[PDB]
Write a protein that binds this ligand. Structure first.
Ligand code: NAG
Ligand code: CA
Ligand code: CA
Ligand code: CA
Lengths: 265, 48
């Protein structure tokens, strides 16, 4: 059990495919859904959770392995999302005005970020690679940046007059900022109501699954404007009600969990 | 009025002794004003 190390693995091509770990992973794992308040609002039923649980019970998932966790709105969810389960599903409504925020949410939860803190009053920060971004959470973040030159002086901005800084956010609950990698930036931030963290995007999180409910696929996880990929756990649906959506999820929960895979870290 | 004269119940401030013993008449309040004051904030200073 050599943890903290990475060793060469080996195998063969003559070994046969083993049994189906389904009907056991459901029992020794847990499934957490994240629905919006609009769903329960439209529904207007108190026993819909027990109903979906008794339905899951047919697919194999036992009674107390399923969890439902409401969220009033996509931004309130983006505010410190704490996903601690063994299989997470996230039903996400589409709004053309919220596109960037509901893509930042995806880039935050679908992936696994290694996040170090940040202190703006003392230091001036720079990015090193293309995956070392700055994610800001809080209730209203107003972020301004002033890049510096080789000799610690601004570029189109002054290091005293914060009004001359360059604005990238304006009262956003979640922000993910990428800047030019190789230049030191001086920052202004609403530290009182927002925390900023310098995070490196590691390999992806195979434990969550986003399901867009409405419009066409728009989520550009990769900040670089060349890939625009569609990952396997990035699902779309077209909706007019919510019971049909929940029945679809329950009937196709095995494909979802096949698209997902228990975490590594 | 002026006793011993026909000038009675006239309305107005007579300029004989307007102060009436008081050191000064005072009025308090606030007031806001717009101006075109100069500033740079903070340009035109040396580059360093
Ligand atoms: C593997 O699957 C086969 C076919 O269902 C079954 O007969 C066998 O018992 C399974 N292996 C074990 C160890 O149960
Ligand atoms: Ca946002
Ligand atoms: Ca970058
Ligand atoms: Ca400027």
């Amino acid at each position: 059990q050599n943890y903290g190390i990475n060793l060469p693995i080996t195998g063969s091509m003559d070994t046969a495919y083993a049994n189906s770990t389904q009907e056991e992973t459901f029992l020794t794992s847990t499934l957490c859904l994240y629905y919006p308040t609009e769903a329960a609002t439209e529904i207007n039923d108190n026993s819909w959770k027990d109903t979906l649980s008794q339905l899951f019970l047919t697919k194999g998932w036992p009674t107390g392995s399923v969890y439902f966790k409401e969220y009033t709105d996509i931004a309130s969810f983006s505010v410190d999302p704490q996903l601690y389960c063994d299989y997470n599903v996230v039903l996400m409504k589409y709004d053309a005005t919220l596109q960037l925020d509901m893509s930042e949410l995806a880039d935050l939860i679908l992936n696994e970020w290694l996040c170090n803190p940040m202190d703006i009053t003392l230091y001036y920060y720079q990015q090193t690679d293309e995956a070392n971004k700055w994610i800001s959470m809080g209730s209203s973040c107003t972020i301004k940046v002033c890049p510096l030159n080789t000799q610690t002086l601004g570029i189109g901005c002054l290091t005293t007059d914060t009004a001359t800084f360059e604005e990238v956010a304006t009262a956003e609950k979640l922000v993910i900022t990428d800047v030019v990698d190789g230049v030191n930036h001086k920052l202004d931030v609403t530290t009182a109501t927002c925390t900023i963290r310098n995070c490196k995007k590691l390999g992806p999180r195979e434990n969550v699954a986003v399901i867009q409910v409405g419009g066409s696929d728009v989520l550009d996880i990769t900040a670089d404007p060349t890939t625009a990929p569609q990952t396997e756990r990035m699902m779309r649906i077209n909706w007019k009600k919510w019971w049909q959506v929940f029945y679809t999820v329950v009937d196709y929960v095995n494909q979802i969990i096949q698209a997902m895979s228990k975490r590594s870290r | 009025s002026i006793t011993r004269t026909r000038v009675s119940r006239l309305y107005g401030l007579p300029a004989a002794n307007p102060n009436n013993g008081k050191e000064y008449y005072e009025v308090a309040g606030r007031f806001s004003l717009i101006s075109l004051v100069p500033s740079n904030d903070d340009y035109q200073t040396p580059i360093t």
